[PDB]
Amino acid sequence: MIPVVISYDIYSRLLKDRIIMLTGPVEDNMANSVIAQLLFLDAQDSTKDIYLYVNTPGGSVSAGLAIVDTMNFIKADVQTIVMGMAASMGTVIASSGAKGKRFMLPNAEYMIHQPMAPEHLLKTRNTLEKILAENSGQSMEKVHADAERDNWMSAQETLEYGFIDEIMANNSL
Amino acid sequence: IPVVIEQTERSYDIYSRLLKDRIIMLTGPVEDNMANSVIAQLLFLDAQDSTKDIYLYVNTPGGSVSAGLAIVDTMNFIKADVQTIVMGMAASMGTVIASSGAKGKRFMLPNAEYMIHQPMIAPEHLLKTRNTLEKILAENSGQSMEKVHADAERDNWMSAQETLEYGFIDEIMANNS
Amino acid sequence: MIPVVIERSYDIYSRLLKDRIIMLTGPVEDNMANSVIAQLLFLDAQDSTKDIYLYVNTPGGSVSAGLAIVDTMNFIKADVQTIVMGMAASMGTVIASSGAKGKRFMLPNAEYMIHQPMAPEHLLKTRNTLEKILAENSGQSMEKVHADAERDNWMSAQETLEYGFIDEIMANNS
Amino acid sequence: MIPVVIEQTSERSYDIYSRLLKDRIIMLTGPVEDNMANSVIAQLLFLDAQDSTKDIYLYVNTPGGSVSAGLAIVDTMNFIKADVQTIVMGMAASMGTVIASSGAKGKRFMLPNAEYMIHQPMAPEHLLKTRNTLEKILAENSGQSMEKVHADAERDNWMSAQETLEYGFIDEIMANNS
Amino acid sequence: MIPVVIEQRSYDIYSRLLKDRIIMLTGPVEDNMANSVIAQLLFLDAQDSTKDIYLYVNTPGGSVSAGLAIVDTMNFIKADVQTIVMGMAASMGTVIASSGAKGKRFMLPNAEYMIHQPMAPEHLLKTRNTLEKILAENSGQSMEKVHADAERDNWMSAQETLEYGFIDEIMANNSL
Amino acid sequence: MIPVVIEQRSYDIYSRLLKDRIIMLTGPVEDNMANSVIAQLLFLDAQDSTKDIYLYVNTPGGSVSAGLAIVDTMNFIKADVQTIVMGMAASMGTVIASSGAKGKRFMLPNAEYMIHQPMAPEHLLKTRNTLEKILAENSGQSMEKVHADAERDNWMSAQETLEYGFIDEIMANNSL
Amino acid sequence: MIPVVIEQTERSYDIYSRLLKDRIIMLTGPVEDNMANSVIAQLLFLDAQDSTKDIYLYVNTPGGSVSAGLAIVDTMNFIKADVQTIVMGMAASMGTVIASSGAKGKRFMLPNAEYMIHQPMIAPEHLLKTRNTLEKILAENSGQSMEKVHADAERDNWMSAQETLEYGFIDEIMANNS
Amino acid sequence: MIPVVIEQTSERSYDIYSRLLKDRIIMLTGPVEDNMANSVIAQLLFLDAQDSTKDIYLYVNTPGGSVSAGLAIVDTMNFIKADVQTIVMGMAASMGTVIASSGAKGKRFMLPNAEYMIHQPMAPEHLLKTRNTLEKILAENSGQSMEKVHADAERDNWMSAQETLEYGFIDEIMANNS
Amino acid sequence: MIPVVIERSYDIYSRLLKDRIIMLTGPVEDNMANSVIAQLLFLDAQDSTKDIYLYVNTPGGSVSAGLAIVDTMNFIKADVQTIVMGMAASMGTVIASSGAKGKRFMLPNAEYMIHQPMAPEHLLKTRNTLEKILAENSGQSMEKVHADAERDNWMSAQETLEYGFIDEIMANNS
Amino acid sequence: MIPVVISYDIYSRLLKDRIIMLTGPVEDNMANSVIAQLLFLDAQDSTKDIYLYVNTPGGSVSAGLAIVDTMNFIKADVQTIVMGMAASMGTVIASSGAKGKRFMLPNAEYMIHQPMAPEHLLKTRNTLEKILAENSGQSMEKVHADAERDNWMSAQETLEYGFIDEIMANNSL
Amino acid sequence: IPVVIEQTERSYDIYSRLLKDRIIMLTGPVEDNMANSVIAQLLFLDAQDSTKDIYLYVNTPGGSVSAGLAIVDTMNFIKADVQTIVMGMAASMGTVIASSGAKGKRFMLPNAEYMIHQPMIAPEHLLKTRNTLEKILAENSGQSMEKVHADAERDNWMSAQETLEYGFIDEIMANNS
Ligand SMILES: [Ca+2]
Ligand SMILES: [Ca+2]
Ligand SMILES: [Ca+2]
Ligand SMILES: [Ca+2]
Ligand SMILES: [Ca+2]
Ligand SMILES: [Ca+2]
Ligand SMILES: [Ca+2]
Ligand SMILES: [Ca+2]
Ligand SMILES: [Ca+2]
Ligand SMILES: [Ca+2]
Ligand SMILES: [Ca+2]
Ligand SMILES: [Ca+2]
Ligand SMILES: [Ca+2]
């Protein structure tokens, strides 16, 4: 464990203040840690916001969509904050945050391409694209068309597209 | 392993703090070791208070039949009703487990997927066990065993909507937004 | 094997964190970078008016993670002093450079390397972004930085002060 | 297998190294690299913050290692106003000698059967630059000429405790009191 | 960690013995275990340097450098360090054990002892001379004869070892 | 190489059969074995394209790309390529075997057949459509029904396979 | 490693190919696709050379792959040439199905060889059908009820040359000529 | 398992590929890299030395690979005055397409179920330079605009045999004569 | 899997050796380098008056082995033409460059890289030795070569002809 | 095998003309191949010279000294030719060639440091130094003193020291 | 594996061309596989012509006692005298083998080294075998077995000069220059 007082992580201090770090590739283990943290924070107080910092290259669709259904299901609004990068399921997750409370760091980048029986994979990619469309107010056909490209979007581009609501300040100037 | 502190200064991990609220996390492949943890958790909560419900969240690809069935039998033995919430996916033994949750109280998240195919010592043993898993599946859902046997003989992923239709869950959980 | 101070049982890095010190060591990659960030966010919430002291000793590494440190440093109100010890290369200088003006130090024997190693068009956009940050942090031109960085060229502390990546070289008090 | 020590107060529990850290003892052990160095430097910064007037005891037993990690230790030792004593046990080789010899003057010790080698093993023109730097520190630390240190360092001989006193890298050999 | 007790990481059997000034030096001699041993020796001495220390030794041998750091530390501290050989002591093992406070070096009766030290060649010869010198200082036998006997791979019974001078008493079989 | 004969590397049992226009396609379908098979097919055709070729097939399946290169090469050359299934034919196996000159596709009586083809998803679906199309062309059955039966993991006896249309005759048990 | 021999017409043959000229094939080790495709290759060769001359197939295997074993049996049964079998050392599982499918009257076994007709074994209904087939073949080859072969094949017991004769799986035990 | 072919003369022995090399057939197979390329180029240089007026048949089946190894093949094909025909079988991807499309004009074929992908997977500013080069060759080879090829190459779709005729990378699809 | 021509059974590289062609591929290291040398020594003994054609396609590698090829080329009387195909970097250009004057070719799409990557004083003596050879082979100054080589800079065939590392770019005859 | 006619190496062609390549690290296997080649060439004609090309970083002392005793023992003079480098036992071998017939390529380098029970290793290093002294006409004390350094010698330096007799020409000028 | 061609066109490797001149190369660790090659070579030469000598060059660290002794017994059984030439080193079984060469005809190169220590199933077997190897060593050299046993109980490397003194070889081979 890293910065440790006594087992008591730096991350566990941030959790007292309702913050959750989503970090590294999304696979079942970290997803269930994030999910447990959400059900816990909801149960403590379903009326205070939760702040879900996201920095992931992506990964498992099943685990990522489980975090997402968990997010939607808990009454508490889950703000999301992209830092460094969100790709693959990282964009599905981050964009599914509460409309008006989705943020992003200025130098971070965003990537909505979803790399994946094949009949089923195609269905899943459609559900995933459907969701990015609902999250951005954009048309499904636009998202499908934009996603098949392997282009990274700036925070400015991600804002104009609708996946987020404000880019974080450079409070040093 | 994030950590939650309570004051009066003692220190749970997050899964343990949920267990104080009677939540259990059945996650990853079903094998003996994680199945024992779940079974000990179940026995412990029931003894602590057999009136309150237990909430078993299931996100699993399946795994050993033996270990899954020990989980089922424990859920069925203890007095406390075991709700099951399928998140992510429930494949093979996953569905045997989640569907054996107390009827009226089997939930699934909107985007979870389901799979009742049961992949599989002697061949006539494998048959008996596979009929047994289908036999439980059929009882759980309200369907005939012939029905279950032909639909478990394909690699059909089921949506939550299809899972409710078929009878393995009672309720799709909501999206609040 | 990380030592412990009772005050109740801090590890040596947690103890230094009470005094608002964060250590940044080894290669910059997602996990260590997400740790430094969690400490910065934690420290900013504790007190936004008090300065944070960030020691920096790294060969560099991932642009994504390192640019997450820079942004977090910039996002929080609390000024982030940076102390370079041993070395700072590649992303390490982008981070150390981005300390609050006047509050960027370096130990006498440390070394600096502003070279940034690395989808082709995308790589070229990322390198322009880093060289732009380094120019703003040094009061130098983008053309000067671009030329100095395509050398593999180590810089003493004196040289690094002249360039203006730091503000003060710290003492040899013995 | 790190033994712990129970002290009874108001009951606390230290591993042995952390117990020694209460008496301002740091253990520089094994190869020098970015992690163990970071740990040493953190201990140095802590102790000094507690009390700049009480000394620090750095026991040294290393084959040497990374030049940049070693120079970060050296530079922390010099930056903190607290005097850092060095005690070479077993061996100090290469970066271990630049470290040990930078201990406060008059307070650099070495066990009798320990050994010392000041050779500094090494992109071309940079390697030359750091080697001059390392030899320059070794020279200032021993009151010798850099010319001299350059000659001796390259010849890959080990020095006994006695020879290392004669050279100027330590100030005292600790005794055989038993 | 084994077998353990947590507090009113954990308080294992070696930490409990260490409370009675008992240090256990086992397995091959290398830098990590030697640094643990040296830190234990400096600790105990700091607490009371008029009280003996009991160093149990069971080791195939290993690093000369680390073994000599253990030996010099034993000799630096004013507290006497008794040594007890159990099972085997070989190479740096013997150099370490035979350096126990004179009068207070013991061996178990079926333990075995081997003074052979397997090893740039000018430097290997030099450290070997140091070890053989120390062995002779500890035993009361001449360097020439220590050198002769180490150049062979014979194990020594506790009786051969006491007669040689590396130990002071064999511990008894007390079921007799 | 096995069992071999050197000359008046060596002349192994497969080279000897190849003299009688017999090609053996075995193990998983991958690029190296497929290139050997294609080179054999082009060789034999060049020597005499009016003389049949006998391609023995025993394979779990494998690379679609390589399997389709074997199939197109069979079809390009004017020489008819008889195919004989032995042991098993699965996936690209069946696609390859069922593409034998019509009238001249055989199977051993205890051999087994499996038309399921395990597999960017738009492209995986596309190649799967190609295979299923070919299976239907070779069998005389509809794509719909080929698609239905391939979506299941059932092995087929030589009798089920002849009735389905992938083969033309089952070879006899001649010890009767 | 395996040695070489010359024959006249001036040609090298490895010992196995020399034995092939006498229509002898050697089947040894676990039944898997490589060795089984090699035995089949050989059997096709002999059939192309002369479809009426007898073939002599030596068998020493603990069994293995069902698909590849049945490929051999079927190739043996397809070609009109009588395939004689000689079990040596052991024949177990597919080995007994292979050896017992030799031409009636021409299945042999060495006096200390051992037989074992138990068949161990991807979907489960298919595995059951496959085992029926194997016992069906064993029944035919021995002239016994499938019922009896089922019971006897469950046991996992080892038969001697003489017990293999009594069962009907072989026709003659070969002599000790000393 | 490379079969050999015996021809009787005055008795010689070719592996199948070397036998095909007598008819001026070369097999470009597997990933493109420095070794298999060297072998191809050596075959190209040999055949051409024998007779500059007889054509060369390069069958192609590769996932692509090294750009410099591929461009060495391409440049040998163009340097030798002998016309090199290309036949894509199975697949040609990436460097395999730059190679195949540089076959003599009118003599570039492709099997019906084969597939073609002209995406060229990629130190920064150099990678841009070679990608322009590769697209420039692809453009000249297909009579298309480079703008066009740049658009289509980056979109990572596969092309059927028919589509590849429509594009200009081949001249003929070989038939299903059976 | 190296093809064969009967003439009695040459492998494709031995057959080309009858025509005095040697191929130089992959990384330059002791074993392949000792092979090329054995071929050069063999070919020189066969006829010292006839030219040898050396094809060169390599990323570079060991200085010792590569400098053994250069010396062997220089030691034998028979002129050694060098044909660069694909690429020649680092030691590969020292070798290709050292072909006989007028007889140093390059295929149109090949690339050149004169950078030479690498006991510190010794490394610096070796790099001066290589840069000195490259200067003599190109008719350029040691200062020019030294500056151009500390870039990581790929050269087209045109650029390489201008520099004077080759004499002719060979045709695209299609 | 490399440039192959028929098993028949490029190296085996050079051997018809009495040339032997010594290459890679000297260990027992390659040493016994070199030794077999020497006894063969001696037996064919003990009056024609043998040409031993050497390019080795060094290695096993026992195997290297076996090549050397073999060289001295066969009546035929063994010329040696250093190319690329000779280090450790490579210098013992190369320098033990017939006095007046030891050659070296102009850019090759040479290294007489001999890196190695310790009492025995020291004896072996002395025998090795003894031999380099006999081979160069230099004093043993000079060789010992020069060898403990890890310095590489030029062909010019190696000539002035006496380990060789002529540096090969650059016949391109 | 360099190759030698003879003309009348047939092609030996170098070790095989030496074998035509009755030379055998016992090299590397003594194990069963290389020992068989040597034994086949020995049997083959003796049958071809039992009057001419065989020249066994030995450069070996030692190895299996079993396999070495099979080599010795073959050298001693066949009629043709087996000269042995120690080059590089001869340790353990190496020395048992080389010293069992036909007396008068055991050679060693000037710089070769020798080692009769024999490093070593049940302990009383190891003893019998070790006495047997010493017993052969003693017979070979002309020394008593007590002598051999105490000198084989050290890690003494022997020079050629010491090896001639002691009796394991007949002649140090010359340096011509
Ligand atoms: Ca919510
Ligand atoms: Ca809301
Ligand atoms: Ca219940
Ligand atoms: Ca700030
Ligand atoms: Ca003491
Ligand atoms: Ca004494
Ligand atoms: Ca056809
Ligand atoms: Ca049809
Ligand atoms: Ca038959
Ligand atoms: Ca020349
Ligand atoms: Ca000679
Ligand atoms: Ca002479
Ligand atoms: Ca004899």
I51/I54 Cα distance (integer angstroms): 10
Backbone gaps in chain J, preceding residues (C–N over 2.5 A): 6, 116
Position H145, amino acid: S
The Cα J163–Cα G20 span in angstroms is 63
Catalytic residue (one of A60, A113, A144, A154) = A113
- Report the alpha-carbon distance of residue C163 to residue C147 in Å, rounded: 13
Touch criterion met for C and G (3+ Cβ pairs within 8 Å): no
Subunits touching D (CB < 8 Å, at least 3 pairs)?
A: C, E, I, J
Q: Would you give the distance in Å from CA I147 to the centre of its chain?
A: 22
Contact G164, G115 (CB under 8 A): yes
Yes or no: say if D76 and C85 are a contact pair by the CB < 8 Å rule.
yes
Does residue E116 have an active-site annotation?
yes
CB contact under 8 A, I6 and H15: no
Retrieve residue K171's tokens: 């002649």
CATH class of the region H1-178: alpha beta
Residue B23's nearest CA partner among B82, B106, B98, B109 is B82
- Picking from J172, J20, J163, J57, the residue whose alpha carbon sits closest to that of residue J104 is J163
Q: Any chain I CB within 8 A of the CB of J21?
A: yes
Chain E: touching chains (3 or more CB pairs < 8 Å): D, J, K
Nearest CA in chain C to A14: C42
Give H159 Cα–ligand 3 centroid separation in angstroms.
58
Please answer yes or no on whether F58 and G71 come within 8 Å at the CB atom: yes
Give the span between the Cα atoms of I29 and C169, in whole angstroms: 46
Burial class (CB in 10 A: 0-12, 13-18, 19+), C126: buried
Of A142, A157, A58, A34, residue with least CA distance to A104: A157
Q: Please give the biggest Cα pair distance in chain B.
A: 59
Burial per residue of H131-144, b for 16 or more beta-carbon CB atoms within 10 angstroms, e otherwise: bebbbebbbebbeb
| Distances from the Cα of K108 to the Cα of G30, J37, J66, K81, K85, angstroms | 50, 19, 10, 17, 5
Which of I14, I62, I115, I156 is labelled catalytic?
A: I115
Kindly list the distances between the CA atom of residue G151 and the CA atoms of E7, G147, G155, G166, in Å, as whole numbers in the listed order.
64, 7, 7, 16
SS (HEC) of B108-139: ECCCCEEECCCCCCCHHHHHHHHHHHHHHHHH
H84 Cα–ligand 8 center, Å: 36
Q: Tell which residue, I37, A44, J57, F173, has the closest CA to residue G140.
A: F173
Subunits in contact with chain A (3 or more CB pairs closer than 8 Å): B, C, F, H
| Phi, psi (rounded to 5 degrees) for J128 | -70, -40
The SS3 of residue I149 is helix
User: Would you call H128 and C121 a contact, using CB atoms and an 8 Å cutoff?
Assistant: yes
Q: Report the alpha-carbon distance of residue F118 to residue F138 in Å, rounded.
A: 20
Q: Which chains touch H (3 or more CB pairs under 8 A)?
A: A, C, F, I
The shortest C-alpha distance from F122 to chain A (Å) reads 7
Interrupted backbone of chain I, residues before each interruption (C–N > 2.5 Å): 7, 118
Closest to C46 measured CA to CA, from C18, C74, C13, C71: C18
CA trace torsion A119, A123, A126, A131 (10° rounding): -160
Which residue type does H117 have? M
Cα distance between residue E35 and residue D15, in whole Å = 13
What residue of C is the nearest CA neighbor of D36?
A: C2
Output the CA angle H154-H155-H159, nearest 5 degrees: 110
Distance, in Å, from the CA atom of K59 to the CA atom of J32, rounded to the nearest integer, reads 9
Confirm if H42 and I23 have CB atoms less than 8 A apart. Answer: yes
DSSP A116-149: --HHHHHHHHHHHHHHHHHHHT--HHHHHHHHSS
CA dist I155 and I157 (Å) reads: 7
J109: three-class secondary structure by DSSP:
strand
Give the number of whichever ligand sits closest to the CA of residue I74: 10
Chain H hits for C127, Cβ within 8 Å: 124
Say yes or no for a CB contact (<8 Å) between D79 and C171.
yes
Q: Are G110 and G86 in contact (CB under 8 A)?
A: yes
CATH 1.20.1560.10 fits domain E1-176: no
Cα B74–Cα B78–Cα B83 angle in degrees, nearest 5 = 80
Phi, psi of G114 (to 5 degrees): -130, 145
CATH 3.40.50.2300 matches C1-174: no
Between strands H56-62 and H25-29, the pairing is parallel
Where is K107: in which H helix or E strand? strand K106-108
Q: Which residues of F touch G38 (CB under 8 A)?
A: 2-3, 13
- Measure the CA–CA gap between E127 and D90, rounded to whole angstroms: 12
The enclosing H or E element of A84 equals strand A78-87
Tokens representing C171 are 């003492």
CB J81 within 8 A of CB J105: yes
Residue J23 β-bridge partners: J55
Interchain contact E148–J (C-beta under 8 A):
no
Please give the positions of K annotated as active site.
92, 117
Type of residue found at E69? A
**To probe the interface with E, which of D15, D16, D94 has the most E CB atoms within 10 Å?**
D16
By C-alpha distance, the chain F residue nearest B150 is: F152
| Maximum separation of any 2 CA atoms in chain C, in Å | 53
B154 interface with F at CB cutoff 8 Å? yes
I123 touches chain D (CB under 8 A): yes
Determine the distance in angstroms separating the CA of F108 from the nearest CA of chain G, rounded to an integer: 6
Nearest to D27 by CA among D14, D13, D45, D39: D39
Place of tokens 């916001």: A49
Cα(E1)–Cα(G86) distance, integer angstroms: 61
Burial of J75 (0-12, 13-18, 19+ CB in 10 A): exposed
Q: Would you call K4 and J11 a contact, using CB atoms and an 8 Å cutoff?
A: no
CA of A167 from ligand 4 middle (Å) equals 16
Q: Contact at 8 Å (CB) between K170 and K105?
A: yes
F126/chain G closest Cα distance in angstroms: 27
d(CA F39, CA C68): 56
Which residues does residue A50 pair with via DSSP β-bridges, in sequence order?
A78
Q: In terms of Cα–Cα distance, which of D110, D7, D1, D76 is closest to E39?
A: D1
**Data resolution in angstroms:** 2.5
| Contact (Cβ atoms closer than 8 angstroms) between residue C74 and residue C44 | no
From the list C75, C71, C25, C77, the residue with the least C-alpha distance to C46 is: C77
Residues H28 and H62 sit within 8 Å (Cβ to Cβ):
yes
For residue C130, give every residue at least 6 positions away whose Cβ sits within 8 Å of its Cβ, in sequence order, or none: C63, C91, C94, C116
CATH fit for domain J1-173, picks 3.40.50.300, 3.40.50.450, 3.90.226.10, 3.50.50.60? 3.90.226.10
Superfamily of domain K1-177: 2-enoyl-CoA Hydratase; Chain A, domain 1 (3.90.226.10)
Task: Give the distance (Å) from ligand 6 centre to CA of residue E48.
Answer: 27
Tell me which residue of B88, B95, B78 sits closest to B139, measured CA to CA: B95
Distances (CA, A) of B68 to B38, B43, G147: 10, 16, 36
Q: What are phi and psi of D168, to 5 degrees?
A: 105, 5
Query: Backbone dihedral region of A100: left (phi > 0), alpha (psi from -120 to 50 degrees) or beta?
Result: left
Enumerate residues 26 to 55 of chain A having a beta carbon within 8 A of any beta carbon in chain H. none
Q: What are the residues whose beta carbons fall under 8 Å from the beta carbon of E165, sequence distance 6 or more? A: E138, E139, E140, E141
Residue E41 to residue E20: CA distance in whole angstroms? 13
Cα within 13 Å of Cα(J81), Cβ side:
18
**J98 close to J92: Cβ distance less than 8 angstroms:** no
Residue G59 β-bridge partners: G27, G87
Could you tell me the residue ranges of all domains in chain E? Answer: 1-176
Residue of chain D whose alpha carbon sits nearest to that of E12: D3
J144 is catalytic: no
Do I98 and I71 meet the contact criterion of CB atoms below 8 Å apart? no
The backbone torsions φ and ψ at residue D72, rounded to the nearest 5 degrees and listed phi first, read -75, -35
DSSP state for residue D175 in the 8-state scheme: P
Report the catalytic residues of G: 93, 118
Query: Do the beta carbons of residue D56 and residue D86 sit within 8 Å?
Result: no
Contact D124 I119 (CB under 8 A): no
Name the percent of chain I in helix, strand, coil, to the closest 5: 45, 20, 35
C-alpha pair distances (Å), A110 with each of A129, D93, E26:
15, 49, 55
Using an 8 Å Cβ cutoff, are F175 and G103 in contact?
yes
Best of B65, B117, B126 to disrupt the G interface by mutation (most G CBs within 10 Å)?
A: B126
Q: Which of J60, J113, J144, J154 is catalytic?
A: J113
| Of H60, H172, H160, residue with least CA distance to H109 | H172
- Host H or E run for residue A50: strand A50-56
From the CA of E142, how far away is ligand 5's center (Å)? 24
Report yes or no: F172 and G78 within 8 Å, Cβ to Cβ. Answer: yes
Contacts of H163 (CB under 8 A, 6+ apart): H116
- D120–J contact, CB cutoff 8 A: no
Ranges assigned E (strand) in B7-126? 10-13, 23-27, 54-60, 82-91, 106-108, 113-115
